[PDB]
Design a protein around this nucleic acid. Structure first.
Length: 515
DNA sequence: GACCACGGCGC
DNA sequence: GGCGCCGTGGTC
């Protein structure tokens, strides 16, 4: 042990009062180097001494620093190394338990664990040049970008949501009142246990589906959809469920999450959470804001730009299919994207839509038989033979090596590619050949975020949200159209493929208007 | 108060 | 056919 401050390039360790760095109280700050732990007397002011957040969960501490007006960029993170070695490595505890060490609740030990786990996992990346490139060029600099993004937050029209809440509440009460009549008695409509008995035991409706673990008569939307005219209560329940779903998840909780220092809504972009290399948003989740239903579109208008600013929404156009074309090298599918006609009138030479989106997931003919209503695909695979050839090629290589790769080299280990149970094996297969498609699209989006962000700062623009294949920026009205033009070009040319990457742009005062 | 499994559902 | 969060129900 040595007294604060630590020397240059030391690994950091810290303890928060809660997982959300924007709401966290920094309880303890420490730093280790050469096995020598430096503990801070007072954590908050000791942040001024550090010049780079370097260690486990570095981005989180960086977000807290940005919250306190301190410029503390995140550098190395053993979590990012482990994630590239294996996407199943998602948490410091799991990483420590796998590669040695104990993840505890003391800042000094965490700083020591960070230095060690790094040297361990860094030595494992020796010779892994494609994994090292992803670290230096994508993941490590992206953490610095996501730090600024999380600390920036998005402006939210709270008053509009408070108003919308009262409006939805009355339609919910109206629907709940009618369900009670048709049932002949009141009951908890939010309780699926109670709803099952009313529909299937009391009113005697055909119970079709059944729950997985416990085996109960399912009352899901899919099951109820077939009963939506068998009785009016089924129609009223599904309407009721949509409103309660949106109100209890978005309309009510979100206005309670406005930060007192920024006055904006702050989310967390988890960098090591998915098995494909995708990002995930939590606390709250802003990657699943409603947009489908009419009421959902109303909720999205609550997400507004600052006064004197505009939102810039950039969406990739079928990036996965374009990736699939590049990975397969299918001459026919490439020609469809290359010429620039409607991608689906051309792959028809609605039936063409569903499998052109479903082939990425391994959509069987069973669901297509139900979706398009024809009785019980092969026509598609003969139009694009290399696509089928690529799937078989990926699965074959997946069984040998034990993992599948993205374009840049991001790997996911699929163990059940040789299971003796067909349902298990074919399930793992669908996970196996989807990862290179979803992972590459994730790699492209990530790399696009890395290249674009410093261009935003130099133009006085902001990066607010990422929705897998979508970006939401914030730029002053003056620079708004210039930012949209530069951002569009950074995203489309992030990494030149055998097919061009298309991006649609949109500018507005809110998320709904811009998109 | 806290915790979690489950079903159901938003993207 | 990759995610996070809701209320319910149960437990501590």
């Amino acid at each position: 042990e040595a007294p604060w401050p630590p020397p240059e390039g030391a690994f950091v360790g810290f303890v928060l009062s809660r997982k959300e760095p924007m709401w966290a109280d920094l309880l303890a700050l420490a730093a280790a180097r050469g096995g020598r732990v430096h503990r801070a007397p007072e954590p908050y002011k000791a942040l001024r001494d550090l010049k780079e957040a370097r260690g486990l969960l570095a981005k989180d501490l960086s977000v807290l620093a940005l919250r306190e007006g301190l410029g503390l960029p995140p550098g190395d993170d053993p979590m990012l190394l482990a994630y590239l070695l294996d996407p199943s490595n998602t948490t410091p505890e799991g990483v420590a338990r796998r590669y040695g060490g104990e993840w505890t609740e003391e800042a000094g030990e965490r700083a020591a664990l960070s230095e060690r786990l790094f040297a361990n996992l860094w030595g494992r990346l020796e010779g892994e040049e494609r994994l090292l490139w992803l670290y230096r060029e994508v993941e490590r600099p992206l953490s610095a970008v996501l730090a600024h993004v999380e600390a920036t937050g998005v402006r939210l029209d709270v008053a509009y949501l408070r108003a919308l809440s009262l409006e939805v509440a009355e339609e919910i009460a109206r629907l709940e009142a009618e369900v009670f009549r048709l049932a002949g008695h009141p009951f908890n409509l939010n309780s699926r246990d109670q709803l099952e008995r009313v529909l299937f035991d009391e009113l005697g409706l055909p119970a079709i589906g059944k729950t997985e673990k416990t085996g109960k008569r399912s009352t899901s939307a899919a099951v109820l959809e077939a009963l939506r005219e068998a009785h009016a209560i089924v129609e009223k329940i599904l309407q009721y469920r949509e409103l309660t779903k949106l109100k209890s998840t978005y309309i009510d909780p979100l206005p309670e999450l406005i930060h007192p220092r920024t006055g904006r809504l702050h989310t967390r972009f988890n960098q090591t959470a998915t098995a494909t290399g995708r990002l995930s948003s939590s606390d709250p989740n802003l990657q699943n804001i409603p947009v489908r239903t009419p009421l959902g579109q109303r909720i999205r208008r609550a997400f507004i730009a600052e006064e004197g600013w505009l939102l810039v929404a950039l969406d990739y156009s079928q990036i996965e299919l374009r990736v699939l074309a590049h990975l397969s090298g299918d001459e026919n599918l490439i020609r469809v994207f290359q010429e620039g006609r409607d991608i689906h009138t051309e792959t028809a030479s609605r039936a063409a839509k569903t499998i052109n989106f479903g082939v990425l997931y391994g959509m069987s003919a069973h669901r297509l038989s139900q979706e398009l209503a024809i009785p019980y695909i092969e026509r598609y695979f003969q139009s694009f033979p290399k696509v089928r050839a690529w799937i078989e090629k990926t699965l074959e290589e997946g069984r040998r090596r034990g993992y599948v790769e993205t374009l840049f080299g991001r790997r996911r280990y699929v163990p059940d590619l040789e299971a003796r149970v067909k349902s298990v094996r074919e399930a793992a297969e669908r996970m196996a050949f989807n990862m290179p498609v979803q992972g590459t699209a994730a790699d492209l989006m990530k790399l696009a975020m890395v290249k674009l962000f410093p261009r935003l700062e130099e133009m006085g623009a902001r990066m607010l949200l990422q929705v897998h294949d979508e970006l939401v920026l914030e730029a002053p009205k003056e620079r708004a159209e210039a930012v949209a033009r530069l951002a569009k070009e950074v995203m489309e040319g992030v990494y030149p493929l055998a097919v061009p990457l298309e991006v649609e742009v949109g500018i507005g005062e809110d998320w709904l208007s811009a998109k």
